[PDB]
Amino acid sequence: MIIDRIDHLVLTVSDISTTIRFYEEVLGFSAVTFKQNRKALIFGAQKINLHQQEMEFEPKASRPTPGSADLCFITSTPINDVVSEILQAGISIVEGPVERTGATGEIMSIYIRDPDGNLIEISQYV
């Protein structure tokens, strides 16, 4: 078995609409509906499926929990330009631009939180 990449992942949220607005307006993701009533956010060649509490389709994680996610995204946009966009959006920065370790090398990152409390790390390689 040879694994190439992560295709997508599932986020459990309290309210899909609130989550969709955050990700479309702040990170520029694109919301879509598949299988008649399922929601997902598209970005690059990957996606994130959304499961609302009380509507978590199966199979699912053993302990579905809103606000338990900690994701790092790579941006092609200059990181400083990202900070400003985040600030202009009215979003609070958890931790300003700071050097971190990426999968390949060193990255400069910014941290913010989504509506449920999940930690979102937007980064760029050094």
From Swiss-Prot:
InterPro entries: Glyas_Bleomycin-R_OHBP_Dase (IPR029068), Glyas_Fos-R_dOase_dom (IPR004360), GlyoxalaseI/FosfomycinResist (IPR050383), VOC (IPR037523). Is critically involved in promoting the replication of S.typhimurium cells inside host macrophages, suggesting a role in the establishment of bacterial colonization within macrophages. May be involved in the biosynthesis and modification of the peptidoglycan layer of the cell wall. Transmembrane segments: none annotated. It comes from Salmonella typhimurium (strain LT2 / SGSC1412 / ATCC 700720). Residues 5-125 form the VOC domain. Induction: Up-regulated following infection of host macrophages. Disulfide bonds: none annotated. It holds the Pfam family Glyoxalase. This is Virulence protein STM3117. It comes from the Bacteria. PROSITE patterns: VOC (PS51819). Keywords: Virulence.
